[PDB]
Symmetry: C11
């Protein structure tokens, strides 16, 4: 079961080599920091797909060990909220890494939307930072200053396009259901 599943030699060796790879510019987003340098980052859903592909859908796991609301301050009808979350990522063999993420919302008049923004971003932030610890392929490169301006010296690539033809159109999945019947 999960946490007691020891890696085979072949699967171990493949995953080790795979994690060294750095991410191409298709993976990286940007936004200029307020008053300062354009911070590069990876979007949450890309990290999840990376992990799901790196380890398998049943190969990694994550939980929220703790989340905490540091402050909600009201100044002239506007809200300022910071939230941290502690996120622990685990693999099928028991391996694990845990890190902190943070979340911010300032200036909205809805207290709710402030807290919703902060509480949510704190978690994925923690999830991304936790996953980085497994190697380059899950975001560990994003902070290598040498790697970064290498990306800036690459031609600005126009976004991809997804082909929604063979997209999932019904709930039913006969291929899995067949395989699952052979499980019980």
């Amino acid at each position: 079961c999960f946490g007691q599943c020891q890696y085979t030699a072949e699967e171990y060796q493949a995953i080790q080599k795979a994690l060294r790879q750095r991410l191409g510019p298709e993976y990286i987003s940007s936004r200029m920091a307020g008053g300062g340098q354009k911070v590069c980052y990876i979007e949450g859903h890309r990290v999840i797909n990376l992990a799901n592909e790196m380890f398998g859908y049943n190969g990694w796991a994550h939980s929220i060990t703790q989340q905490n609301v540091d402050f909600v301050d009201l100044n002239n009808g506007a809200f300022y909220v910071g939230v941290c979350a502690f996120v622990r990522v685990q693999l099928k063999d028991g391996s694990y890494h845990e890190d902190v993420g943070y979340g911010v919302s300032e200036g909205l008049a809805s207290k709710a939307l402030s807290l919703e923004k902060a509480r949510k971003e704190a978690v994925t932030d923690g999830l991304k930072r936790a996953l980085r610890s497994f190697g380059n392929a899950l975001g560990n490169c994003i902070l290598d200053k040498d790697y970064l301006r290498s990306l800036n010296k690459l031609p600005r690539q126009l976004p991809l396009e997804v082909d929604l033809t063979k997209a999932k159109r019904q709930d039913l999945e006969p291929s899995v259901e067949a395989a699952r019947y052979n499980s019980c």
Copy 2:
């Protein structure tokens, strides 16, 4: 039993592939977000049926680790409520993902209905976000802003009428009762 059954290679392979698939326009709704443009999301019952079909009715599970009422504010005879929930989804082999969901009710005059909406929406929101982490087919595609733009480039779908003919007639389920009898 649950938390123990290892995936077979057969079932693992099928589910691994199945989860990569993106979701068609059948699955996406749109509201009008606070202060911003059209926001896409998936309604809860679709996530449920996706999961139930992806993993089996007994193949996945979820619990509420915690739910906190952030505030109940009375301003202009209307109640403003924010609620978070932490929802952990687990599969039959012990693999798991947990995330936060949030629930908001602003402007209703019923304190009761405000608390009810926020508490109930916090839970569903957390269940969806937790399920996302398993892959595209359970909602991870919804945030790929490239997927969303390609989604608008398809003809508008019309409400598919559901054929209620073979609807469940009696409580009784004879095939189940036969199978359940011989399981003893």
Copy 3:
């Protein structure tokens, strides 16, 4: 035993199919929401019987993880009470789902009866929300607003009539007691 009984393939598949089924109008009720539209729902006693038929009387279970009284307000000789309950449903193999339910009492002069209503409604509501996570047949179809529009397609049903001719009238259940019976016949 319960929590450790794994489903046979012959049983797993039947339930998997059966849970996909949508519910006919025999299962659906409606009432006037406060200030708004017709809201459809399934009554608690039907969800219970659905679960009993889907899983067996000993195939599913539920517990109250927590109940909290959000407020008891007194306004003009009337009480306002809101209560949540966290209800966790489990099947005999350990799979489980948990959700929140809510309960409301507005306008009563009895605080006691206000709390009684809210606390109980919260639990039954939470039980239903947890069971429906298992599929359409336990109530997950009720929210598909294509399903609801299709429901308004069938002519409104006549209420079913209960035939009490074979109603249970004594505690004894010979058929049940017989299944337990052991002859105890010895060798001599």
Copy 4:
């Protein structure tokens, strides 16, 4: 031992079919609601006997998870008390149901008798609500507004006469003592 004892096919089958039965008018009582309609209910001692015959004296069990006094209010020389109880019923195979019951005492001048009445009524009420989850025969039919209509269409009959000719008059139970001796 209790909680670890699987149902045989024969016992499972008989109980599953038996629990579907609706209850005859012998089981049903009625009471004046304050300001409102006749309320039908089943008396506790009748549910206990139903459970003992359905499951065996050692086939079911119940405990009080928690009881809380919601309030003790004194208004115009009378006490007003509400009490909730959380009652969990379990069968010998480990299956279980838990529900809340409520106990009310309005108008008595003794705080003692008010609390006694509400505390005990809460437990019994919770026990009844928990057992009803197993099926019609244990009380799930009482809320079925169609069931209640057919009950009204039956001739209102006599009360039963109990024949105390075979009533227990002595503590000793030779059949039990024989069976228990032969078991060590």
Copy 5:
């Protein structure tokens, strides 16, 4: 050991049949109640002997889950005390029932004797309510109004004369000591 001693069929069937029996008038006591008819009840020492003969001295057990003094009120030099107790009864196979009992002392001037009376009555009251869940012979018949009516029609009998001829007079138990010795 206790809690792990599954019942044999021969003892189960004997006890299940035996618990159905109603109790004769030898078991029932009466007091006139305020605002109602005579109230019937069974004295504690009779329930204990019923339980001992039904299950064996080592076949049933009880503990006090909790006892709570609801209040000690001093009014007019007199004490009003209400106490509840939660009592859990278990059989040797692990079967169990738990209930609340209540204890009342109103009008006494000694706080000590008020608390003593209410605390003890609460435990015994709770034990009686728990044991009657096992069936009619342990007191569940006492609440059946039809049984009660039939009891009233029964000839009233003068108390039993107790024959102290072979009352225990010395501590030693030779048959017990012999049996205990053999077993080591």
Copy 6:
């Protein structure tokens, strides 16, 4: 070990028979309650020897689940103390009974001796009440008012005379010391 044994049929049967016996007047003492008639009781040291002879010195056990001082009141230089104890008796096979005992000291001027008397009597009182749940021979007969009236029809014999001839006079126990050596 203790709690994990199991009675042989022989010991079970002898003890079940012996516990039914009622107690002769040798065991019964009496005191006039404050303001009321005579109360009959069994002295603690008698209950202890009954239990030791009934069950063996290593066959029964007791612990104090809890002791609570209800109040220490000083009124006109006199102390009023009420104390309860919860006492659980267990037999070697794990069966158990728990009850409450109460201890009272009213009117003394020494606070030390008030607490001492109440605390100790509460424990002995609870032990007596717990052991009597095992049957008549351990005190359950004391509540049989018919048993009591039958006792009054017996002229009270003179206090027994104790023959201190074969009294233990040195610590050493040769019979015990011989057996203990062989058992290693």
Copy 7:
């Protein structure tokens, strides 16, 4: 090991017989109660030696479940202190008895020596009360009013004389050191 050592038939039977013995006047001491008559008691060091000879130095054990200082009162430069202790005695097979002891110091001018005396006496007192539940030989006889009457009718005899010729004078115990070496 301790708590797991079932008694052999021989050791059980010797001890059962030995514990019935009443104690000679060599064991019994006396004091005067405050304002009243003679009170007999057994000194701690004699109860310890009784237990060691009855059960073996490794056959019984005791622990302090709890000690509470009920009060430290200062009256005209004199301290009044009451302390209770809960003491649990266990035999090598797991059987056990627990009781409360009380310790009193009145009138000393040192608060320290008041607490020391009270704390230590409560523990010894609790040990005495717990051990006496095992039978007459460990002190249960002292409360028998008939035993005390017979005891006061025996000759009051001379203080014993201790022969210190065979007293231990060096730490080493060659007989013990021999046996212990032949055991590893």
Copy 8:
């Protein structure tokens, strides 16, 4: 290992006999106490060595269940401190005894050194009282007034000269190092 190692028949009977011995005057010290009494005691280091020779360096153990500072009082630049300790002694077979010890410092002007003396005396005192329960040779004779009377009727002896010729002068220990190597 410790707590698990049962006693052999030989080691048991060696220690049982040996523990009966009363101590010679080499072990006994005396201080003067308030009110003129001569108080006899055994010094800590002698009790430790007695225990080490009776049980082996690895045959007994002790822990501090709790230590509490009852009070630190300042009167006229001098401190009054009382400290208790609960000390539990265990033998290698699991048998155990626990007792309270008390530590006192009165009259010192250094608060620090008062607390040091008190905390340290409580622990050693508690160890002495705990070891005492195993028998005379570990101090139970100290409280016997007959033993004490007999000690005075003995001629006094010069303090024994200790011969440091064979005293350890280097850390290294060849005999053990040889034996320890042969074990791994």
Copy 9:
């Protein structure tokens, strides 16, 4: 599973040799300390990659034992925040080291990013210090002042230029997916 796999003979030997190696100048950065000379440190992402390469992506793990915010101080519109974190690193055989890290924000005008900065740096700061404990190659050399001297005596090396040709381009990992497939 993780924490349960004991190192092979030569895996140990290779890692034991490898960890002694000192780090080259490619790894070291420097920030001008406030008011003082150069302080050298190693950036988080390189330590992570060092650890991943030293032990394998699944060979080491880390968790945040605790994090605390020592202070958030507001002085003239500037925020001062200190945060500590305790980080525990574990190897696949259970070996572990734990240490503290610290995080600081001085001078920012935003409360949120101040807390964000401090909490996040404390964690990674805490991660490095713990990993350093495994040997020179994981950061233990940075504190050797001779090692730092020899570093300045080295040619001032230009930054790396990472070759983004073989950068990871798509989520899917066929070699891993193949190896993962054949492990079920």
Copy 10:
């Protein structure tokens, strides 16, 4: 493993005999008590080496069950600090001893260095006090006044000159590496 490793017959005999040894003057130090006599003691490092040689570096262990700061008093610009520590020492077989140590700093003007001194010396003091319970050789002789008399009659020996020729000069220890590599 540690805590579970029984002593061999030969090693037990060696350590038992070895521990009797009294310590030569090489181990003993002295000091002035404030206004007090000559206090003899053993320095911390000497006990550490004594234990390491007596039991093996892996034969004994210790932990701080608790440390508590009794007071930090500021008197005349000087700090007075008292700190206790509870220290538990364990041998590889599960044997253990726990004792209290105290640490004192009086007269320093730095609060920080005061607490440091007290906290540190309490631990060493407690470790010494716990170790000495194993026998004379580990420090139990220091309290024997007769032992201390012989120390005076022995020539005041000089502080030994230590030969630093064979001092360890490099981290590497090749001889150990052979034996450990041989083990995996």
Copy 11:
């Protein structure tokens, strides 16, 4: 795994003998205390390398049981901070030692940098003091005064030159990867 691996005879004997060694002056630093003696110590990183080499990178482990900030004092724009930490060191066989360390910062004007310094010093301080318990080779001789002044009698060496040629320059580690691949 770690904590469960017993030392081999060969490895024990190597480590025992090796730990005896005293450390050369290459290991020792010196800093003069304010107004008093020059105090010798060992730098943290040297102890780590000593420990890593003495026991192996996987042979020893350490954790922080607790860290406390005793006080944060601001006097005239300067911060005074004292911090203690309790650090527990364990070997692969379960052996352990724990000690307290302290961390000091006085006179800095930045609260953040003061607390950072103190928290980090206490851990390293505690780690060194715990390790010194394994023998002289890990720092136990540093306090031996004969050893200390003997250190000055040695030619004061200037720091040896570190050779950065063979420094680890890339992350990749081929030798370990070979052994790591075959370990599966």
